[PDB]
Design a protein around this ligand. Structure first.
Ligand SMILES: Cc1nc(C(=O)NCC(=O)O)c(O)c2ccc(Oc3ccccc3)cc12
Lengths: 11, 242
């Protein structure tokens, strides 16, 4: 889970 | 009283610059601000769902500013990806509430959300926050006489972000080490500032408790917001921080 937050942290 | 060391000044500059660069509208916020009209957010007959919609639209960029603040802190970037998500979910609403509370205007009795939307106590109450709305406005009213500057707000945000008591963390000790760096820098910067308020540091430490409570209550109230409203109505980034 947390795919959106996780992509914002990787960006 | 002891004042910042050279390493602490470096740290002061880093978080202050991270805060200033992620704070919506920055210096302009009082000019770019429009009042939510009184006909939106009045008490019903539960939730006034037109006010709910307006807050639903602005919550995603508010969270995102917080994510961008943490990413500008080298200590936050040291942490594994999993602890980062845990730390962001725990402090998001605490930091947003603080960012709104320092933007209280006693002339209008408003808080400014998103750098743009000025809302009253009743509008934020009826739009879905409930008693937590009273808690934020009370926080903002008592923060006028503290005269916080961007550095002090930046450090409060750091202290909340580096909370090792969030459940599921692996770097408990590492994260608490970081928090004590911000707290000592913060105390030393407060010693250097010479506020005309007695027992300033103790009183500030009490406001951190206030924000932790707001944070824990927003999370409570959002589960009690899955009553009238279906999950579709909440934006996806909001759901991620339950
Ligand atoms: C607590 C806070 N703050 C801010 C904010 O942007 N202001 C602070 C800032 O400058 O970053 C919001 O935009 C919020 C939006 C919604 C919210 O709850 C709700 C969520 C869904 C429905 C109703 C209220 C709390 C906010």
């Amino acid at each position: 889970e947390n795919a959106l937050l996780r992509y914002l942290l990787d960006k | 009283k002891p004042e910042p060391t050279d390493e602490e000044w470096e740290l002061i500059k880093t978080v202050t610059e991270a805060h200033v660069a992620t704070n919506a509208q920055g210096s302009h916020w009082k000019q770019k601000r429009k009042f939510l009209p009184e006909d939106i957010g009045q008490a019903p007959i539960k939730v006034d769902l037109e006010a709910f919609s307006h807050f639903t639209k602005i919550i995603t960029p508010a969270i995102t500013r917080v994510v961008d603040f943490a990413k500008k802190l080298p200590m936050f970037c040291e942490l594994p990806c999993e602890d980062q998500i845990i730390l962001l979910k725990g402090c998001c609403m605490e930091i947003m509430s603080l960012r709104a509370a320092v933007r209280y205007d006693p002339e209008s009795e408003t808080l400014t959300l998103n750098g743009e939307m000025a809302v009253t106590r009743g509008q934020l109450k009826n739009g879905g926050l409930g008693v937590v709305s009273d808690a934020i406005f009370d926080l903002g009213m008592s923060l006028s006489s503290f005269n916080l500057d961007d550095t002090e707000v930046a450090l409060l945000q750091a202290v909340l972000l580096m909370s090792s008591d969030r459940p599921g963390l692996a770097c408990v000790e590492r994260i608490e080490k970081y928090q004590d760096s911000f707290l000592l820098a913060f105390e030393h910067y407060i010693n250097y500032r010479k506020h005309h308020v007695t027992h300033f540091w103790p009183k500030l430490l009490m406001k951190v408790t206030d924000l932790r409570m707001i944070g824990a209550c927003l999370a409570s109230r959002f589960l009690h917001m899955k009553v009238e409203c279906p999950t579709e109505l909440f934006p996806p980034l909001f759901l991620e921080v339950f």
